[PDB]
Symmetry: D2
Subunit: 317 residues, 4 copies
């Protein structure tokens, strides 16, 4: 009178589980990229909506044949979040408004899944990373935001498109705040270990032949030019998050530039999360790479650190 | 005075190129799934919109660091479509309205890329597959629609969820029209080569203990219940298309149930594209699996074939 | 005076760790397949040789740039085995000789890594699976051998090559002992849910047009015909093991035919590991699929079960 | 009276085909890595042995269930080689002995597959790359050897292990001849865009605290220390080749350091293949990165170029 009884003779817990907070344009970009990489053994989704959340879950589950993920669960309560190895926080609705949400969600994240690494994808990323470090009570190394990871990704595609090579080949970084105030360190930009700064001194300046400073002006401009055209950017930031979840889940110790506490380095006493190249692993951020910067470059960190803390002093937690 | 000149000393054509027609909810689901599998060596996007198309391209290109795809191009003209190995047609706006678009696009698809396989993702899939076979002048085997591939995928997730196993293990099929009129062949449903029909005869009927006929009623119902909640289904049908592009590009000879001409089998003289298990390869559809069906099951094909052709007779090409 | 101090500012445990026991022809096939799939976050290797083991480790580590695995460790002591999520036992040198090795290794496996699933790859697989269940003190569901998984794989490639389709499409199984005595269940053999037994009754017999019974005679023959030509088979059984480690690590609940205790089903009171389709997950074997067999087919299990226990009664543990 | 006739109703050419020349320790490392990445839509194997070749083919084909490759063919005649997109030449048995084989094979490679890129894996790689450019009549850009690609890979694993990070993060190169005479360019070595040479000047020298010059001494030493222990290195060089076949097949334009003609740069008039960072694509080598080297470093290229041509002058083709 039953198939399951007659067919399947019995001889759980999440393993690599990842939770994505929010089903929005960018939160379902991260999920389908995380599932497209087969990182998570369970994918939990949580958002304040009752139905779309259930519709995003069912639309993914119907593709479970095509996925390496077994259990895809989504609820509006954070019970599903339990046992999450990483919690990707895309939830966002101006900081003190977002701090209304993160008071509302982040401590629910941590009640059910204490070990989780919290990756903060939502803009503003640098402050909402502090917001989520304050009120989650997780260590410094278990709460990090996406940050300039995607900026570094956009920067390498641009730096490659001008050279025609593949973005993985052209290595250059973006540090600092996520506005016009990001630091593109040209001392590290290079291809095949051939420094570009070395050969052409005109880089990192006001003017140059190709005015390569336009690249960093295009890096910060393209983010919006994608926002202009289709209304907001998702699959760029969802591929970046999936690549971070890969570093942490697969425990690779890869260097991503992510938002972490800058207190103690680059002349900053304030508790501020600013994007710095960091070695990510299963445990959290394992370390930070120490970036040798021009006095002028450390200045942009220092100043832009203050721009955050100047408006991060009035946060009401 | 130039990096590219000084750095890169010179010592093209698309290879696996895939074009996706449309940037809509489901057309960018297919792209990011195709890119997430690294199938296409070039991904061309085309849609009637000037800007979102340019925004979907740039949002993908910014993730090129994270992708195995080198060139992602998008234009509103079909010059980009040139040399496409597969053209995934998601464009859709009721058939004779869609046949306005496919007159407008499909012959532009074929002008630039004559060898392309045309995969038709758009609803109605069975008729718009005929529409695109009529006016493209491609062989029967190079024009196929998605069809019940995703229905078969939803059907296996359901058939597995009731058994708790993984959808790849539970093998069952969906043939025929894409409405309530799909044929779930229970003679093939099984797990680990254990036929479910064999053990419980009550399957495929009006009533059963678990009333397993509800599965096929849930297969056709879930498609809408995803449409209800979030407004439309994308990442299920985009993972299905990416799995079809994989069969054809990687030239696997895998059996998918896709929309192909049923003239000559199952008592149908009409030229009608109805979903049948077919062996897909690089060349196109290589063949069809011959499905042994109940008289009653061949009837649903036969009748539902007529439901198509009854309204496929008045098509104005 | 140090790069590491100046460069990397500090802000462990194995996660998915897999241990492969033995570096032999088949044990390095499993490793490079497991690493080629990026399953293990750490790969531990252990074998009785001091140097080749260190050479197999270094030859893999030099490819770490190309791998998704971070730490590849190999020692002759089983300290490295610690925290293994799965222990793949390829060690083998006739059962009571192999039981000399498994007394020597298997309890060292379990001292350092109590939670490990033990996958037994080594021939004889069915008995050395019992040998390793007796003396490891692990549950029934955490000790399983490869078994007819690869037989099922060879069987599907053959069953497909005759049909020209891709082996993933043609579903047919191999149960029982690993000699000529395997059970190819033809009641489950099919393609696209079209039973082959159904249409041609001459299958599973003495004679047929194509004498499809030759397939199962070729399945058991090819294993040796690979052993004849190059001396032994590795990358077939290493891809099979990597696909098992994937089911268990990725926690997929996929159905593989593996060696598990048959006590209680198919009329067997003896404690005997015989290859049966089983649902594998992170926890172990989750269940067994109940295979509906001809009286004659249950007989081959029953008899071949005794052939094992007849020589499994004199095992000295 | 036939399954294939009754089941499969008909509705070819290699696409991405790769040929590996030789089944030896390193030639089956490349195959199982190429198949493990699903690069080739057909894999052709060729070697001078009748049986092992047939045994290597069958051992791979039995794993076809687990592979994304459909057709794996192996013959001793080069008919199978036809339509190869890349031909990986592992065949080797001292140059003028190897030039006996490449007279015997390389023109058979090119008779059946004129468009093929020829990747030369076999030691000596730099000369046997010239040997195969002379007698194949392919362009400069379609014949390249593995070269210091794997040296660069070993160099990054070492450079990372000292830093604890993941080898993909630490970017440093190996140019030139494949002996002790390789050039480790320290001007490019760095992590997260932080030059190591910049901070510690003692690098690239006779003595340093960690004497980081030992890394390049370990890079060249480890190659042999793997050769010592297990007799020869395979899965390092097979993962490197699979990563080259990926750059070329997937048409990525990635920068690998491979053996190409150095005539015209670094003060070399001779026709000599020496390892230089090069942008690989579908067409061949697309270009070369221009490496800014110390006078002393250009010297090692210049001199080691002569060491090749001094014994490359007496080649009898």
């Amino acid at each position: 009178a039953t198939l399951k009884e007659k067919l399947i003779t019995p001889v759980t817990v999440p393993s690599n589980k990842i939770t994505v907070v929010g089903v929005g344009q960018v939160g379902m970009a991260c999920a389908i990229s995380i599932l497209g990489k087969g990182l998570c053994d369970e994918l939990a989704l949580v958002d304040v909506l009752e139905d779309k959340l259930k519709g995003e879950m069912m639309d993914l589950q119907h593709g479970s044949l095509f996925l390496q993920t077994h259990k895809i669960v989504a609820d509006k309560d954070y019970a599903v979040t339990a046992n999450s190895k990483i919690v990707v926080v895309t939830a966002g609705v101006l900081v003190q408004r977002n701090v209304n949400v993160f008071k509302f969600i982040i401590p629910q994240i941590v009640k059910y899944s204490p070990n989780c690494t919290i990756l903060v994808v939502s803009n503003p990323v640098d402050i909402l990373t502090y917001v989520t470090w304050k009120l989650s009570g997780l260590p410094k190394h278990r709460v990090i935001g996406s940050g300039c990871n995607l900026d570094t990704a956009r920067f390498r595609y641009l730096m490659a498109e001008r050279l025609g090579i593949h973005p993985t080949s052209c290595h250059g970084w973006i540090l600092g705040e996520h506005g016009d105030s990001s630091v593109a360190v040209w001392s590290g930009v290079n291809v095949a270990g051939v420094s570009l700064q070395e050969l052409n001194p005109a880089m990192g300046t006001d003017k140059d032949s190709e005015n390569w400073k336009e690249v960093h002006k295009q890096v910060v401009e393209s983010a919006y030019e994608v926002i202009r055209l289709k209304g907001y950017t998702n699959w760029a930031i969802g591929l970046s998050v999936a690549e971070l979840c890969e570093t942490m889940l697969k425990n690779l110790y890869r260097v991503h530039s992510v938002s972490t506490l800058v207190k103690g380095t680059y002349g900053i006493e304030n508790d501020v999360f600013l994007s710095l190249p960091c070695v990510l692993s299963a445990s959290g951020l394992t370390s930070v790479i120490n970036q040798k910067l021009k006095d002028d470059e450390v200045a942009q960190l220092k100043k832009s650190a203050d721009t955050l803390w100047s408006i991060q002093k009035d946060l009401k937690d």
